Design a protein around this ligand. Sequence first.
Ligand SMILES: [Mg+2]
Ligand SMILES: [Mg+2]
Ligand SMILES: [Mg+2]
Ligand SMILES: [Mg+2]
Ligand SMILES: [Mg+2]
Ligand SMILES: [Mg+2]
Ligand SMILES: [Mg+2]
Ligand SMILES: [Mg+2]
Ligand SMILES: [Mg+2]
Ligand SMILES: [Mg+2]
Ligand SMILES: [Mg+2]
Ligand SMILES: [Mg+2]
Ligand SMILES: [Mg+2]
Ligand SMILES: [Mg+2]
Ligand SMILES: [Mg+2]
Ligand SMILES: [Mg+2]
Ligand SMILES: [Mg+2]
Ligand SMILES: [Mg+2]
Ligand SMILES: [Mg+2]
Ligand SMILES: [Mg+2]
Ligand SMILES: [Mg+2]
Ligand SMILES: [Mg+2]
Ligand SMILES: [Mg+2]
Lengths: 50, 51, 194, 50, 100, 121, 148, 182
Amino acid sequence: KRAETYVKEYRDVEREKIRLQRAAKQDGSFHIPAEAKLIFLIRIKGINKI
Amino acid sequence: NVQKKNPLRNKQVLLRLNPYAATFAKEKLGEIKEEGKPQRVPATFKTLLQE
Amino acid sequence: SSAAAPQTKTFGKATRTVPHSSEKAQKWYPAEDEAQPRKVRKTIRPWSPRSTLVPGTVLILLAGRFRGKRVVLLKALDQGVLLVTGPFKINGVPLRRVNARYVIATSQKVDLAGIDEAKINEIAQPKYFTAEKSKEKAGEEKPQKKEVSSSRVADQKAIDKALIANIKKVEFLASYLASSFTLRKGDKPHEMKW
Amino acid sequence: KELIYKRGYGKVNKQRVALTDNSIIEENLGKYGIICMEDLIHEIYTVGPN
Amino acid sequence: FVNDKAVGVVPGEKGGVVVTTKKAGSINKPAARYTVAFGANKTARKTYKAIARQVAGYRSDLLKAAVARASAIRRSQRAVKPEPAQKLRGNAAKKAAASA
Amino acid sequence: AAKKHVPIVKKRSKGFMRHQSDRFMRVDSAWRKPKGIDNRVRRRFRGTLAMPSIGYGSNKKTRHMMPSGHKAFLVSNVKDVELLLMHNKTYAAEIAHNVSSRKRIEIIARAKQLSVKVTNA
Amino acid sequence: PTRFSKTRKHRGHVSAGKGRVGKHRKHPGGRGMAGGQHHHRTNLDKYHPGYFGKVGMRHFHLLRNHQWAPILNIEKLWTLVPAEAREKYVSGAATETAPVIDLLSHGYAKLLGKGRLPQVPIVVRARYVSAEAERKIKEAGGVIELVA
Amino acid sequence: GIDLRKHHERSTHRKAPKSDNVYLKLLVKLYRFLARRTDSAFNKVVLRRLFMSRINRPPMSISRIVANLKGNEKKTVVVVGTVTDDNRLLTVPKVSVAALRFTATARARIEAAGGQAITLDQLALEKPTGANTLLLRGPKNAREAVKHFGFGPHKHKKPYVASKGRKFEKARGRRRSKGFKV
RNA sequence: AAGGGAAGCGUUUGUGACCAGACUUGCGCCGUUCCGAUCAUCCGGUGUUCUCACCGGUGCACUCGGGACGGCUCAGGCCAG
RNA sequence: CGGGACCGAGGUUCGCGCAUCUGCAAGGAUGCUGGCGUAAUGGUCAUCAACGACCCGUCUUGAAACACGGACCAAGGAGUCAAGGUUUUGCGCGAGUGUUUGGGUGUAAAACCCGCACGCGUAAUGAAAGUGAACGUAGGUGAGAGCUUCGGCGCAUCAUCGA
RNA sequence: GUCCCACCCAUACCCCGCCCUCAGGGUAGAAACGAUGCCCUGAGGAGUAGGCGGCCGUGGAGGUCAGUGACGAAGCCUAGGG
Ligand SMILES: [Mg+2]
Ligand SMILES: [Mg+2]
Ligand SMILES: [Mg+2]
Ligand SMILES: [Mg+2]
Ligand SMILES: [Mg+2]
Ligand SMILES: [Mg+2]
Ligand SMILES: [Mg+2]
Ligand SMILES: [Mg+2]
Ligand SMILES: [Mg+2]
Ligand SMILES: [Mg+2]
Ligand SMILES: [Mg+2]
Ligand SMILES: [Mg+2]
Ligand SMILES: [Mg+2]
Ligand SMILES: [Mg+2]
Ligand SMILES: [Mg+2]
Ligand SMILES: [Mg+2]
Ligand SMILES: [Mg+2]
Ligand SMILES: [Mg+2]
Ligand SMILES: [Mg+2]
Ligand SMILES: [Mg+2]
Ligand SMILES: [Mg+2]
Ligand SMILES: [Mg+2]
Ligand SMILES: [Mg+2]
């Protein structure tokens, strides 16, 4: 059941961003897509000379 | 676990970890269509996008 | 589980038991236990031949004694083993088993209308070819050809009757099968169509 | 999703333990309502309280 | 010598099997040994049963070893096929052929 | 004999010889670790000798197994070879030198009865 | 035992544990207490304060038998009584007897009042006694006998 | 390569006694089993103290046992060490003491008072979990060597002097009349 | 055996000489020829119910054991599809 | 859903799962087939070939050095012992401890036994004359492993105010 | 000079096998073990001066293997083997 909710939750969040963007275009205003909250870091430069 | 099996490639291992994987495939949740006539931008949105 | 069968032989007066074979002491006991392997989760599934291995197609033998020859596919048996015969009166290839990985499946198909599938069986059934190999392996010495079993001679003769008649109805198929396949200069197999 | 399913290992008693079934996640992150891989993935993608 | 319940199987003088076990309080008395000598003509299966009866009471963790050792002693006492003829390779074959 | 084992894989079948043991006759072939301050072998330069280390160690399951599958046990008596009565599947008799011709025959005779392998019959 | 030594462990390594630079020389720094005021001053000032100088007056023919006066703290007075006798006094068997110790027989001269005493009266014959040792004996009901 | 500051760091605590005492080996085997197969934190501490050396198991006197045993009477005093006798204790009450060792004077006096002088293997019999026990440690820093540790200026520690007198360390760095004070 | 202003050495093949192993069969079930097994008595030991001593076991497709010759299953060396 | 490559560790059942009255691809390879059964695989050595490879020890910031020692081989060749300290480890006894200067005895340079003194420790501090360690459950406060009759007691040790 | 695709390979990164070190668990009304053992899991591995641990070898002493040996000990030679 929790997987059901999450799959639906992911589905609905993406459409709201699209719907908000499209409705802003119709109105003529601008919608800020909100800053990202999660980032993934990758270290790619060794362990020497730091 | 002597040998890690990838759920992304082993279907049986995927099912022990996510029982909703089977329902996702049959219900075609990854291929949901959106219908209806799209609402295009007005002529004011353009001619503002280009100066 | 239990599998004891405690019989009772007579020996004059009705006594004595003589327990079942797999119930008595071993009469020899090892100093160390055997490895006793674990259970294996590998169940045999039938071999899936290629899409082009339709029975009646002409194949090119790439190895073995009859390499380069062209034969007709009769039936795919199992585990990659094919039953083929390039008619013995055409190119001299008897009824023979060939592994499906050492052939080329061409686009030429010979109609098998006239060949009984009943006789295709009982020769696709195994042990047919190597029935008397161990019995006949004399090599103690003017060499002479190992005479072919009269049963197999008759079997090949029966199949060839229908097969050759159908083959001869094509203008060049009879000569095409009688020839052998070779690579000339400029023939690139990766580019050659079959 | 693909990072956690394929290269996702847990930290159990200062040991790197492969996440092959939900028991490891249940017995470690159970106090926070995360009992399965989908719960773990949802808590990462959507920045949750835990 | 260490354990207070010990089992010992040794070959018999005249081709039998001898089983020796420790009695109670043997830590103070060395000669407190209960020894039984099965004959050479006794059935192999019966000898295993007789030893299995005794070892089970004391230890039952030496059931395999006591029975197997009796089997090993019995195996060594039977007749022996001498050997198979040893083939020679390379120079040894050439040397033998040239010599003979 | 040689009941059962994993294949005997040897990580290195050659051995390690001492640095410059081939150029100088006073320097033995037995390995000694180069302790010089400028030595190229000790510094692991490319194209030089390798030094022994763990990592070249043999598998524990097959560490001291001869290619047949047995482990060698040195035997010098008929009473010594009887110790392997219960281990004839994992140990092989090896009659040491100094054993006279007569005593060698008895050890072969007895080890044949025990079905114990003798590596120098 | 020589087989338990670093010497058997340094066989093969050049410097034998003493270093390539700054090698093991003969006497780099002096022989003995050399330079106690000049270059070994940082060791003496740190670990041996009071080493240099002169304190007090002299005593030309000091005989240490004059200064002989072993002490006995009253917390161990009753240990000089034998085990069988000490039982009845300590246990509380009040009676008409009182022990006499005569410390000098046990090799003691002065008596000092460190510990405590049971209220049993006791007689002690001592060469010297302290103020508190006498006070704690009197309170227990004892008697001090000064002897020579 | 991985950026670590330490590699293959070992545990700093002893994991098995260095003693070749065969009887002590049996005692450790018993308390290895007990500490593993019980939830008693008392068993773990007793196992750990059996490993310790002789300077980490200082002797205890009956007087120090008596001092701590109030009002903890009806409890078994457990000392992983040696229990010594005190002359300054004129009477010994009835006590239950379990210890690795007892001096002959201490064992006789405890038993004469009507108490129990038992060993740690006896203790594990009636008290497999330290149900009513008083775990007591002797004075660790009462050793003579500890008086010398950390010597330095203004540390008030004991110097390494081979004699006591007006000489050998009393002049300079010990009084302001000769240079300075420490 | 090798050798166009050094040689030696490491990784890896090819070639030539030499050589150690492994393998030869073994365990099971059913078919021929000779000996003592189930059980009970009588001493003596013993973990108090197991066994050794003598003795009735009487035995050709019946027991027990052993060799002789045949059949079948399983396992078994090296290289591979 | 195809084409290819490398790998098959583990060794009675147990588990997580999927399917359904079968079982499975789900806690690590099985099945079928063929040649040979010996120098065929394999190993050692010699040699050729591809790629690579400066002469060791030493002092030095830096040695292949146009820095020094080294023609070659065998044998010999360098952190030892005593006294006195100290820290740590093991052991015996433990407010004591140490027989062996000496005596008795002996299977006779051994082993065994004996005791008075003495050494160190149990009391320190003063230059010395000298004096010489409990107000108190040998104290109060904070932390504290462990125990708990669940309210508390609290070893060692540390910090602090005292006697 | 700039831009774009494809490809080559370090002892680096990923997966797997094996060695060792370190760390964390299990194993007795013992059918039970060189418990100084065995089983399971994870991480790590350069090194002069230096420190520590375990092992190999030599000359002797006590105990033991009822040890080997003139039917051949010790030594020595051996592009023969493990
Ligand atoms: Mg693994
Ligand atoms: Mg070094
Ligand atoms: Mg030097
Ligand atoms: Mg220096
Ligand atoms: Mg300098
Ligand atoms: Mg690394
Ligand atoms: Mg020239
Ligand atoms: Mg070769
Ligand atoms: Mg693919
Ligand atoms: Mg070869
Ligand atoms: Mg070869
Ligand atoms: Mg070359
Ligand atoms: Mg080069
Ligand atoms: Mg040197
Ligand atoms: Mg310079
Ligand atoms: Mg130059
Ligand atoms: Mg110079
Ligand atoms: Mg010169
Ligand atoms: Mg004396
Ligand atoms: Mg004294
Ligand atoms: Mg205080
Ligand atoms: Mg561990
Ligand atoms: Mg000789």
